[PDB]
Design a protein around this ligand. Structure first.
Ligand SMILES: O=c1ccn([C@@H]2O[C@H](COP(=O)(O)OP(=O)(O)OP(=O)(O)O)[C@@H](O)[C@H]2O)c(=O)[nH]1
Ligand SMILES: [Mn+2]
Ligand SMILES: [Mn+2]
Ligand code: NA
Length: 461
């Protein structure tokens, strides 16, 4: 991913975009009952905390495009992966504007809370002003489509979330590249059925975990994995992606019956962006707020891992590559051990910064004891070991609970944390409930007891 140019939006007929300069995050009722070292990410260039140019820091994620074409390995990876997906019978039909808007089996309705992007975010129009769950009115959308078309600029927003102290001082705030509602609707129409197929088939055949339910899914994973596990995390995956990777992606779409709309993928690749008063163009890089981002990111990852394997271990049997990805996050396995550090090396030649899974200092052996996927661990239940607990560290949970965006969602927010936490064991969960109930707000919430959660879990399978 690399920025080709950037200049004043007025210089090209575009309005300056307004983005709140104030975080919605504020200390919560539990701010002092729990330990935490994260603060609301920098949202503006002014933020007193800064220690380097904001503007520069945020965009540095666009490290450049390391590769130019789709080499032999990438092509073989394309063939093999496209091969597996072929065994899914993925319906190649377009998705009717209705289902694409209010959802259907295997796909949720568009999210009404998130932006609507240009031009609507500059005309003042909002999402609830275009559709409604009970009506399922295509007409209003339809008109806007005919009126403004597709391929509309991406409105870039700085993401309002918690970040480490360093990532604050280095203005390393993450960006949300929101795509116009039109575009999103189009893409959901073109790739609607693909999305469903994936959401409904998390596993090693899609090599995707998107739309999965950790409480149930963690138990199917080990069965799917091969003997030896390997993993690593990417540094700025999305932005590092070169145009070649998008092509490989189209080659895959093409082979599975979507050669039809591979055009849409071009839009994610060669991007048109609006950030404040400035406008820029990006060659490569996956936009963060786009319909399919998650899935396409995962499909590309299936291609990447296959590529570095064919390139490094000639003769390797991909049919025994068992991997599951979720965007940049991946968990893989092979009958034989492989050198992650070595694969990481080939990664650079392909423009990817891969590192020891979980900020390790070095690439060590990956085991069921130390492997994590989605920040979660795998831990067999003491009473019925054949059931696996997805275990999120408490530190993460402690961090999230010390803050709040909307006081009216404290019930839902804490409840959620509880659904993650209890897997850390009953003793641990109770200490958590205890502290929560050590202040008025907590004591007022409706939280599930350990035994309630654990039983409900046992029956869920
Ligand atoms: O809205 C956004 C923006 C960014 N991202 C994601 O954030 C990633 C980069 O933004 P991060 O701040 O998470 O950096 P990092 O995780 O790569 O840092 P390290 O672990 O390597 O030290 C990208 O690779 C993309 O997956 C989102 O998921 N959503
Ligand atoms: Mn990462
Ligand atoms: Mn990740
Ligand atoms: Na881009």
């Amino acid at each position: 991913g690399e920025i080709q140019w950037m200049r004043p939006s007025k210089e090209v007929g575009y309005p300056i975009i307004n983005a709140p300069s104030k975080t919605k995050l504020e200390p919560s009722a539990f701010h002092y009952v729990f330990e935490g070292v994260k603060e609301p990410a920098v949202l503006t260039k002014n933020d007193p905390r800064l220690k380097t140019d904001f503007e520069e820091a945020i965009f540095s994620k666009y490290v450049g495009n390391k590769i130019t074409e789709v080499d032999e390995y990438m092509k073989e990876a394309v063939d093999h992966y496209a091969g597996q997906l072929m065994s899914l019978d993925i319906n190649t039909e377009q998705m009717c504007l209705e289902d694409a808007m209010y959802g259907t089996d295997g796909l949720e309705a568009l999210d009404l809370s998130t932006s609507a992007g240009y031009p609507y975010v500059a005309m003042g129009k909002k999402k609830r002003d275009i559709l409604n769950k009970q009506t399922r009115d295509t007409k209003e959308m339809q008109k806007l489509l005919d009126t403004y078309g597709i391929n509309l600029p991406l409105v870039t927003y700085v993401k309002d979330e918690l970040r480490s102290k360093t990532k604050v001082e280095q203005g390393k705030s993450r960006l949300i590249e929101a795509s116009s509602l039109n575009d999103s609707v189009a893409m959901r129409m073109a790739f609607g059925n693909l999305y469903a197929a994936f959401h409904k088939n998390p596993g090693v055949i899609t090599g995707s975990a998107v739309g999965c339910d950790p409480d149930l899914f963690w138990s199917k994973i080990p069965v799917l994995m091969e003997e030896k596990l390997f993993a690593f995390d990417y540094t700025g995956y999305d932005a590092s992606l070169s145009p070649a990777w998008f092509e490989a992606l189209k080659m895959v779409l093409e082979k599975i019956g979507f050669g039809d709309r591979v055009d849409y993928i071009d839009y994610l690749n060669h991007s048109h962006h609006l950030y404040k008063n400035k406008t820029y163009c990006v060659k490569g890089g996956m936009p963060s707020g786009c319909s399919g981002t998650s899935i396409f990111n995962s499909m590309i990852n299936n291609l990447i891992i296959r590529t570095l394997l064919l390139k490094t271990y000639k003769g390797i049997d991909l049919d025994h590559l068992k991997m599951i990805a979720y965007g940049d996050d991946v968990i893989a396995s092979y009958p034989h051990e492989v050198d992650a550090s070595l694969l990481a090396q080939s990664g650079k030649d392909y423009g990817l910064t891969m590192t020891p899974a979980d900020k390790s200092a070095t690439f060590e052996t990956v085991t069921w004891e130390n492997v994590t996927f989605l920040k979660r661990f795998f831990r067999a239940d003491e009473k019925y070991p054949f059931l696996i607990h997805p275990v999120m560290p408490m530190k993460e949970i402690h961090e999230s609970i010390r803050w709040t965006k909307d006081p009216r969602n404290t019930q839902d927010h804490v409840r959620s944390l509880c659904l993650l936490a209890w897997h850390n064991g009953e003793e641990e969960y109770n200490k958590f409930l205890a502290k929560i109930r050590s202040v008025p707000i907590g004591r007022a919430l409706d939280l599930p007891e350990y035994s309630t959660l654990y039983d409900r879990w046992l029956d869920s399978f």
